[PDB]
Design a protein around this ligand. Structure first.
Ligand code: 3C5
Ligand code: 3C5
Ligand code: MG
Ligand code: MG
Lengths: 546, 546
């Protein structure tokens, strides 16, 4: 039966209702009860407020009309308005107080996830106030979660006029009996009900949601915590910058405010940050989520030395130079974590702050060859297995789906020991042909990785592991320095390759290092514990990069 | 003979020299003459400063070494340092005082324009101070103008060590006698001279430039005012956003700070803003220079109504939604000017501020059809000529080079009257086959337009002119509103189509409108008077959009 759900903005998706500040203001100021509402509604379908709601005039033009109205109401009720009474002030304050009503948004999201078409239908105004940006931000955040946003001032019609409902129905490509409509004003529900829509009168949120649950047959209340918002690749702005003749870097870009450059690990993608990108943009950052060199839509030259840290870092500086960015905050995971530490040591003037997930900062040992260092840790055996050009490429390219499905697994789901890989003859030699799907990833998300890696395969990616000696010699140049810009290290309790204890000496080199630690989190940190990652990065960004 | 010119940063490309603050500080504080220089140089090739300049330690690690040095020098000279004496403070202040020495930069630019290879060779440090961004910005601004930037702390070598000069020569792919080297420290010149480089000792800038002129044989002093910096397309970050299934918008993006969306006119390109893009980014803005729908690398669907203002504006809102931008400053020229006024009237919550070049804001007349309004002005006759699908496309596509060469002309160069175009049978009927090249444009710049327009031709572009009735009906919805967000109108004295007097009533609708006016400027404003446009936009941005 029901296929569509329609929510109002004031008093339903957003609270406190701005309508409601008339009531509060009368109470706070000891005015005659309803005086401000009388003024707000004066003239009815031909008064100032209706012309505003229909888009005939803007909010700033309406303000002095309401003011006049407030005077007229107070004269006929034989009172005075307080010295300094200000409609502009009252409304600035109420529009900024009003916030997304999170449980109602999450119900709309869940219904949309079960197949509902969702819409916002609202009587609202053209906002040209000095502070309009606050409302623009609220609308942006809400509207990406709905199929349609219908605004009275854009369509020239207002609730309760019957034409707006017919316009709704026609927008929804739905008959009225397939629709549930929620509003906190009973007069606004009435024409929907006359057409045989299910309607819900919203006073407190929980009761409305109980009625909504009952009538749709879907669980909306007491539901577990949902995942952060993810990214749909074809909805992103995609950027491309040529950093030298055969090397162009692709990135996805969302948000405004301080530039934050996200650098993924092996064998990954910009898409590995899909849960961080909307959260960090929504927190007030300009996010640039890279395809690192060798991956996705970035160039992937075959030569091994094109992937040494020195070359990669110099390219990332060029990337900032071409974008006209004097700095970015650099956040990396895995190989990208290693990269951002080297950015901080060699280009601190370009790094506003630095954060790594999983990858520790360990100074090079000038008295031991890196390949021997590597041979000393049984869990890095797979790194020796990666050395010989063509061997790991053949195994990893042989069946991409099985490759990402076998790699991307939560800590309780493993099919790969990283144990004696060379001796085993490969990474997947004792893994199934058809792994089950991790709880972390959908089959669609796997096929996105699979399609990215069809372009250039694993040569470029593996090459990141093939510059151990060259990276060691470059790193030895930096052994006298410390990292003294703002820095965060995020350890993952159950990453059994990049273990939290490997980071334990970092304060000797980064004395003011901050930390976060994520329990029950494997190697694929951003997608294993996306909620916790987001919280830790935004806290650290707002305190240290701001 | 000479093919290459090498400049130092401190005291040559940038002034006052930070070295020089030791002198000034001793004088200001009544310290023993040379005390701070003695401390700065203590230990010579093995002291703190040399390790800094070679990249062994960072600036923040060096600060307390210099401090110690300052104490030791003052003890052996039997004096005290003042209470609150601060090396950090002295250096923060000196590094921010130091600015690009504009006449020396413009000499380097001019030599580069006559074929020199140019480089900056500098002893400098790894800057990890809280205020490092100021230096990062200076280096970014300078370095885009040179072939190479060689920094002591990146290469592990310092002037005057002879290896740094050999490294220079090898970088320049030049023998020493082809090179002129300028430095303000004679000891730093000596190894260059030993190799037979021409050297110039820089004290005052003018004298150095006279020697530079003499030895290169090129005029560098008293030279006319150069054009602002332009854009090279293959050096830009190129962005792409799908705003609906068959419509993706391309843009070029440079800079950080408030988003500024530049919207070009007919029949133009993002490249028409090539002189504004670096200037506005350099002024502290995030510039987004669009290919408008129908142009360049943006989609160009054939249908006429895809190009009505309502559809175009709704798309531009979607473009901001997908980029995660709650607002942008919108600056338009010509058709793009018309568009940004409609953005301000219909989406003021998304428009931080609005500026138009040439295009006035004239409310629709609800009592006259727009086509009759158009017939009333003899200079808009070419707009009737554009109505019939396929006619103007055939003339404008027939020879692209002749098309842009005939259109893009300064006010003293015209070959087109816009007079009785329909009756003439076309736009170019009485223009030459091979127009001369305008002073405004190079043959390379013309061929960039020609190559852009080979992708989709003139159908999409002309379609912008084919929605007069549809745009009029939409505009009539807005006749009750005023524009009350910050707004700038820039008139062009010699634009004989979009004449300055057409804007004379705009204050009735935009009572707080600001203005700029450009004399001796034709229709192609950004490329006719790029210096004046830049100055007018940056002044207005910094006061009204900031
Ligand atoms: C460590 N750099 C990325 C990488 C390379 C190879 C394997 C794994 C992996 C695979 C499974 C579990 N944990 C980690 C991770
Ligand atoms: C007015 N919209 C752009 C346009 C269209 C057609 C011709 C010209 C033009 C051509 C020459 C001189 N001045 C203006 C300009
Ligand atoms: Mg309501
Ligand atoms: Mg110098």
């Amino acid at each position: 039966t029901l296929r569509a759900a329609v929510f109002d903005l004031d008093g339903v998706l957003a609270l406190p209702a701005v309508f409601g500040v008339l009531g509060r203001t009368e109470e706070a100021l000891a005015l005659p009860r309803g005086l401000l509402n009388d003024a707000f509604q004066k003239g009815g379908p031909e008064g100032a407020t209706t012309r505003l709601m229909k888009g005939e005039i803007t909010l700033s033009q309406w303000i002095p009309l309401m003011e006049e109205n407030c005077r007229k109401c107070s004269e006929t009720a034989k009172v005075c308005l307080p010295k300094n009474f200000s409609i502009k002030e009252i409304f600035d304050k109420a529009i900024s107080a009003r916030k997304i009503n999170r449980p109602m948004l999450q119900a709309a999201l869940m219904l949309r996830k079960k197949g509902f078409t969702t819409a916002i239908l609202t009587n609202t105004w053209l906002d040209d106030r000095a502070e309009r940006d606050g409302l623009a931000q609220l609308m942006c955040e809400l509207k990406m979660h709905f199929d349609f946003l219908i605004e009275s001032c854009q369509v020239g019609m207002v609730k309760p006029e019957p034409q707006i409902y017919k316009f709704l129905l026609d927008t929804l490509k739905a008959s009225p009996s397939e629709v549930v409509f929620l509003d906190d004003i009973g007069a606004n529900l009435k024409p929907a009900r006359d057409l045989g829509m299910v309607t819900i009168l919203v006073q407190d949120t929980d009761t409305a949601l109980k009625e909504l649950e009952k009538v749709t047959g879907i669980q909306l209340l007491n539901t577990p915590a949902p995942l952060p918002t993810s990214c749909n690749p074809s909805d992103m702005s995609h950027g491309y910058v040529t950093v030298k003749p055969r090397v162009r870097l692709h990135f996805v870009e969302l948000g405004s405010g301080p530039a934050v450059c996200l650098c993924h690990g092996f064998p990954e993608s910009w898409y590995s940050w899909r849960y961080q990108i909307p959260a960090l943009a929504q927190a007030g950052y300009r996010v640039l989520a890279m395809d690192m060199k060798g991956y996705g839509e970035s160039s992937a030259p075959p030569e091994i030395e094109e992937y040494c840290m020195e070359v990669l870092c110099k390219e990332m500086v060029t990337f900032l130079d071409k974008l006209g960015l004097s700095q970015a905050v650099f956040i990396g995971h895995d190989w990208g974590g290693m990269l951002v530490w080297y950015m901080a040591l060699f280009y601190p003037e370009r790094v506003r702050a630095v954060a790594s997930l999983n990858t520790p900062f360990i100074p090079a040992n000038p008295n031991m060859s890196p390949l021997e260092s590597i041979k000393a840790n049984p869990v890095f055996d797979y790194q020796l297995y990666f050395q010989e050009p063509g061997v790991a490429e053949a195994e990893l390219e042989q069946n991409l789906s099985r490759t990402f499905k076998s790699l991307f697994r939560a800590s309780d789901e493993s099919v790969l020991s990283m144990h004696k890989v060379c001796e085993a003859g490969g990474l997947f030699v004792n893994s199934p042909e058809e792994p089950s799907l991790s709880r972390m990833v959908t089959e669609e998300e796997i096929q996105f990785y699979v399609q990215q890696f069809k372009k250039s395969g694993f040569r470029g990616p593996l090459n990141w592991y093939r510059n151990m000696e060259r990276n060691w010699k470059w790193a030895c140049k930096s052994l006298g320095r410390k990292i003294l810009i703002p820095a965060l290290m995020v350890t993952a309790e159950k990453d059994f390759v990049l273990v939290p204890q490997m980071s334990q000496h970092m304060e000797d080199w980064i004395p003011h290092l901050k930390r976060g630690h994520i329990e029950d989190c494997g190697h694929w940190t951003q997608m294993d514990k996306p909620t916790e990652v987001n919280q830790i990065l935004i806290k650290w960004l707002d305190s240290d990069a701001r």
